[PDB]
Amino acid sequence: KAFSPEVIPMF
Amino acid sequence: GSHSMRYFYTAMSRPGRGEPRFIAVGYVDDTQFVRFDSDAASPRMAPRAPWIEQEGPEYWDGETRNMKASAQTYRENLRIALRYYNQSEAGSHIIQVMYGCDVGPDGRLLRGHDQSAYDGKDYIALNEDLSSWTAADTAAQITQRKWEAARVAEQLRAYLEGLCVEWLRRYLENGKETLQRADPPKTHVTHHPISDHEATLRCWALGFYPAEITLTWQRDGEDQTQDTELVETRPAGDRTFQKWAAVVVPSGEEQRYTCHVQHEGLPKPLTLRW
Amino acid sequence: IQRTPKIQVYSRHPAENGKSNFLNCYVSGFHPSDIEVDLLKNGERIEKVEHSDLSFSKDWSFYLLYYTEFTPTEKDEYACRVNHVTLSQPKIVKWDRDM
């Protein structure tokens, strides 16, 4: 199962 | 240690040809088990191995939602990277990401990984501590400062030590017939004359799983590293892999040469000759 | 800074004339990812060709397997034809059953 952060990290 | 799970994302810009394409693929060891492609008629996380098909609708809906949201975020990252490298909006660029966990025989975390690249060059990597970052240049340093402020390393660590290992352990059980079976290589030496004075000896390994293998030629018991042509391990298409190693030998001297084969599937290393 | 593909052309199983098999063209070590691969039967394009999902190695370079069912014979010649941004013209690699 893939990593699923609440807010996905932007560059 | 015994096993790995890895996800690979690629996001590819293509100005004038729609929004950047996002492709995601997941592996356990050398077995692919899922895919997502934003260009598909109906993009969804889709099964690529038998032992994952049994996951229910909530699994598949959740992975699909995640990949769609990831595709959106990686489109924004491509726009951002353009600004950080003073680049024009006319060129085509690529972001890639690899992340996942390694576990030992008892299934505990051996190490975690999270690395990113821009245009095929290292950009930013989570260090083995799962707490600090290595940025490759001053652009990635900007990303590092943002990720440090937002405690991204902590989120990755929670996933790598928790869900990543737990789901890997579950896949390894559900797929135990294949994921926990090594197939040893089938091996032989072939002989191809080149002139009256020389011939090639080619040592073959076929039908093996996992991909990891060592094939080496010795002449009079001495490794021929500098004089061996060794091809990249290649997939057969049936889950298994193939490799060969070759040496050019003087006519009549073939018996001085021995091929040595190491593979997890073999109870001991093999020595072959023509 | 871009990377040209390596190309291997080979069969899934040892070749045996009149026995059905799979013809593989493995492209690897390339960057960027767009690539054109055709499998050829006597210089002509085979239509039913599938490929693996795009993935990449630890050095960030891409790899793909292109594959099709085939029954090798003594005279039929097979090849894989690859184009990539790094190549001024397509590269044709002949299938040699011994490699």
Side-chain angles (χ1 to χ4, degrees):
Chain A
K1 178 176 288 192
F3 173 50
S4 180
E6 175 100 3
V7 172
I8 153 162
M10 272 171 267
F11 278 19
Chain B
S2 274
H3 302 281
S4 64
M5 183 169 62
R6 287 292 188 279
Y7 284 84
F8 299 90
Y9 302 167
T10 310
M12 303 147 281
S13 70
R14 42 175 176 195
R17 300 192 296 108
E19 289 296 314
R21 189 187 195 156
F22 184 81
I23 171 75
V25 99
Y27 281 83
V28 172
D29 302 324
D30 307 317
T31 301
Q32 191 199 151
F33 71 104
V34 287
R35 99 226 290 202
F36 178 83
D37 180 5
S38 74
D39 278 356
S42 191
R44 66 172 204 98
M45 193 74 105
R48 297 296 272 163
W51 46 259
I52 210 213
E53 302 178 0
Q54 65 179 286
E55 301 304 331
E58 82 218 333
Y59 178 87
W60 301 104
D61 291 349
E63 293 309 86
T64 293
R65 276 53 249 189
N66 185 355
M67 296 298 100
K68 280 155 99 137
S70 299
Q72 294 301 126
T73 299
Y74 279 87
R75 296 172 174 176
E76 183 60 28
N77 296 339
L78 282 162
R79 291 191 285 273
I80 290 163
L82 235 41
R83 305 189 331 74
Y84 288 5
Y85 292 103
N86 311 298
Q87 291 170 336
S88 94
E89 292 168 16
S92 165
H93 303 271
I94 297 165
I95 288 166
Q96 311 117 285
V97 182
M98 165 276 262
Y99 69 81
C101 43
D102 297 345
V103 298
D106 58 7
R108 296 167 218 280
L109 182 69
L110 287 182
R111 66 159 302 172
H113 302 270
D114 178 62
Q115 306 169 245
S116 296
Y118 186 53
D119 287 340
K121 215 208 116 335
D122 287 276
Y123 183 77
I124 193 168
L126 190 66
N127 292 330
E128 193 167 10
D129 62 12
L130 312 180
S131 316
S132 62
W133 300 96
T134 302
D137 58 31
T138 54
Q141 287 172 11
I142 309 299
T143 301
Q144 179 174 339
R145 290 179 219 151
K146 285 197 209 194
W147 286 10
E148 281 164 352
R151 305 285 199 168
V152 170
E154 285 92 329
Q155 290 174 63
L156 269 61
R157 182 189 165 179
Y159 168 76
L160 298 159
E161 294 178 322
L163 286 168
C164 185
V165 171
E166 291 156 8
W167 279 88
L168 172 50
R169 294 186 330 238
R170 168 185 180 125
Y171 300 147
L172 278 168
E173 176 64 29
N174 290 170
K176 65 192 176 180
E177 283 181 3
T178 53
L179 300 180
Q180 297 182 55
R181 190 188 81 237
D183 297 316
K186 306 151 182 163
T187 60
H188 70 290
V189 171
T190 57
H191 177 282
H192 308 87
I194 63 220
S195 68
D196 298 348
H197 295 47
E198 272 171 343
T200 299
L201 293 174
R202 177 170 293 116
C203 181
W204 287 90
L206 305 168
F208 57 92
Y209 180 92
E212 172 59 35
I213 194 166
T214 304
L215 291 183
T216 55
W217 275 102
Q218 285 172 15
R219 168 194 169 90
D220 302 336
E222 174 175 44
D223 283 348
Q224 295 298 279
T225 312
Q226 270 289 349
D227 292 282
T228 300
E229 191 194 347
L230 225 225
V231 289
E232 186 190 353
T233 302
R234 70 200 188 187
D238 52 13
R239 104 160 189 149
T240 73
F241 296 90
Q242 312 180 339
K243 202 189 193 42
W244 58 253
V247 61
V248 177
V249 313
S251 251
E253 293 187 10
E254 284 88 345
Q255 294 310 308
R256 292 167 68 179
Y257 288 78
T258 53
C259 173
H260 304 254
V261 184
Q262 305 185 64
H263 181 91
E264 166 194 314
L266 295 166
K268 63 211 171 67
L270 304 182
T271 302
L272 302 79
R273 47 170 45 72
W274 169 53
Chain C
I1 298 303
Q2 296 181 311
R3 288 177 265 175
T4 203
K6 297 161 151 79
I7 309 171
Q8 299 195 58
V9 196
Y10 56 101
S11 54
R12 173 178 308 183
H13 297 302
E16 220 192 292
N17 302 335
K19 296 260 104 76
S20 178
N21 206 325
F22 280 88
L23 179 65
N24 290 330
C25 185
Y26 183 58
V27 291
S28 68
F30 59 96
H31 212 287
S33 50
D34 280 347
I35 195 170
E36 209 203 56
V37 185
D38 296 307
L39 300 179
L40 303 189
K41 189 189 173 164
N42 299 309
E44 208 48 82
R45 180 189 206 270
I46 298 161
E47 281 182 8
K48 348 68 147 79
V49 173
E50 283 170 306
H51 61 83
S52 53
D53 308 323
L54 184 75
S55 351
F56 54 83
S57 308
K58 290 186 210 205
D59 70 359
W60 305 113
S61 72
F62 297 100
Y63 64 85
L64 291 172
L65 183 64
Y66 287 71
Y67 60 99
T68 190
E69 320 206 27
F70 92 127
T71 297
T73 61
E74 186 197 60
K75 56 139 65 208
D76 293 309
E77 288 195 310
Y78 292 91
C80 175
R81 184 176 56 212
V82 182
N83 205 12
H84 189 254
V85 172
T86 50
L87 302 171
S88 57
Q89 53 193 197
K91 183 168 303 177
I92 290 165
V93 175
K94 290 158 89 151
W95 173 52
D96 174 349
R97 75 178 58 206
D98 281 331
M99 297 186 96

